[PDB]
Curated annotation (Swiss-Prot):
Shown residues within the full chain: 2164 to 2515 of 2515
Miscellaneous information on this protein: The TUD mRNA accumulates within the posterior region of the developing oocyte during the early to middle stages of oogenesis.
Domain Tudor: 49-107, 230-289
Identification of the protein by name: Protein tudor
Compartmental location: Cytoplasm; Cytoplasm, Perinuclear region; Cytoplasm, Cytoplasmic ribonucleoprotein granule
Function: May act via the Piwi-interacting RNA (piRNA) metabolic process mediated by aub and AGO3 Piwi proteins, which mediates the repression of transposable elements during meiosis by forming complexes composed of piRNAs and Piwi proteins and governs the methylation and subsequent repression of transposons. Required during oogenesis for the formation of primordial germ cells and for normal abdominal segmentation. Not involved in repression of retroelements.
Record's subunit section: May form part of a piRNA processing complex consisting of tud, aub and AGO3. Interacts with AGO3 (when symmetrically dimethylated on Arg residues) and aub (when symmetrically dimethylated on Arg residues). Interacts with vls. Interacts with me31B/DDX6 (when symmetrically dimethylated on Arg residues).
Length: 353
């Protein structure tokens, strides 16, 4: 299963059936694609049958893809195939063999279905809204949590979250005209590390449970985690924090001389240097970070005295604030609007903050 993992929707008409690709596999897909641009060579499947997996060419996309025969048709027209790493379905005239490089990698497209779908809705409607929302986003990353399903012939049961909003909520909204509680645009959180309006960190109250769990699983499996050696730059792993003497998910920021490095705790959004390093299980590498990097929208940064701001936040370091997300930069940081007890920070500040 996947838990709060970052992904994208490769294919999908309705919320009752769609395909997702994990960012935590972007590495392998990158391989397939490239190691797939390798005409002269070829083959013909093992007496092509159902479930057989070979390759196929797309006139439309003008390229190859890892295939899978869904239906063997009259020779007049090839086969009905399922694109393994996308979820698409084409009718290719001819297949081939699976180059013994790629042959081991499993299909990278997860077949999902929203956990809750709006009762009493025509699919012409559902699919329209669905299609609308996917377009209403694109480029950005979704966050998914799955769980297998009873019927093995059905898609995985998934919960999608885009920009801290429940996908079905946005769905129901789009499907009914119905506008939406502006309160939905705000999200409770705490500022775990403030060092300027262009850069601070917060934890979403909605992620607190997940964070705790992660904190457990680590502690438990802590004792028996191998040592981390390849101290490259930006390499993930667990790493002990001095003042704490605990192991957290971290990323190497600056490799120092010694077996010492500066790491950034991606779950608590703070840095420190440590001697300890241990491998991070893939299981605990799927979930997105739990600390969120932020910067205020320009209008706010403008209307505010960098001075008071720092102070105010210091005084209430453990208090809950709320953030409205305006955009996510490429790096992964959010441009946000900050609020205190629902009043805009820039307003709260002017009148004895």
């Amino acid at each position: 299963s996947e838990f709060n993992s970052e992904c994208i929707i490769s294919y999908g008409n309705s919320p009752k059936s769609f395909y997702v690709q994990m960012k935590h596999n972007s590495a392998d897909l990158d391989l397939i694609v490239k190691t797939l641009q390798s005409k002269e060579k070829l083959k013909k499947l093992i007496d092509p049958t159902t479930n057989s997996n070979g390759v196929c060419y797309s006139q439309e996309d003008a390229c190859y893809y890892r295939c899978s025969i869904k239906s063997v048709l009259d020779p007049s027209q090839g086969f009905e195939v399922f694109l393994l790493d996308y979820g698409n379905t084409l009718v290719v005239p001819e297949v081939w063999q699976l180059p013994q490089e790629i042959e081991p990698i499993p299909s990278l497209a997860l077949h999902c279905q929203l956990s809750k779908i709006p009762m009493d809705v025509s699919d012409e409607k559902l699919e329209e809204a669905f299609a609308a929302l996917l377009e209403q986003h694109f480029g950005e990353l979704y966050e998914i949590t799955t769980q297998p399903n009873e019927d093995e012939t059905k898609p995985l049961i998934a919960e999608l979250r885009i920009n801290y909003k429940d996908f079905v909520q946005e769905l129901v909204s789009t499907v009914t005209g119905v506008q939406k509680p502006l309160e939905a645009e705000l999200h409770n959180c705490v500022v775990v590390q403030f060092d300027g309006p262009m850069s601070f960190y917060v934890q979403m109250e909605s992620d607190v449970p997940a964070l705790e769990q992660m904190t457990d699983k680590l502690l438990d499996a802590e004792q028996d985690l191998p040592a981390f050696s390849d101290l490259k730059e930006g390499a993930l792993c667990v790493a002990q924090f001095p003042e704490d003497e605990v192991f957290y998910r971290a990323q190497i920021r600056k490799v120092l001389d010694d077996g010492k490095c500066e790491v950034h705790f991606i779950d608590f959004g703070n840095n420190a240097v440590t001697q300890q390093f241990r491998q991070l299980p893939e299981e605990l590498a799927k979930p997105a970070r739990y600390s969120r990097h932020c910067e205020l929208d320009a209008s706010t940064i403008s209307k505010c005295d960098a001075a008071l701001l720092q102070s105010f936040i210091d005084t209430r370091f453990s208090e809950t604030f709320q953030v409205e997300i305006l955009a996510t930069k490429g790096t992964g940081t959010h441009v946000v609007r900050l609020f205190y007890q629902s009043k805009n920070i820039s307003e709260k500040l002017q009148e004895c903050q």
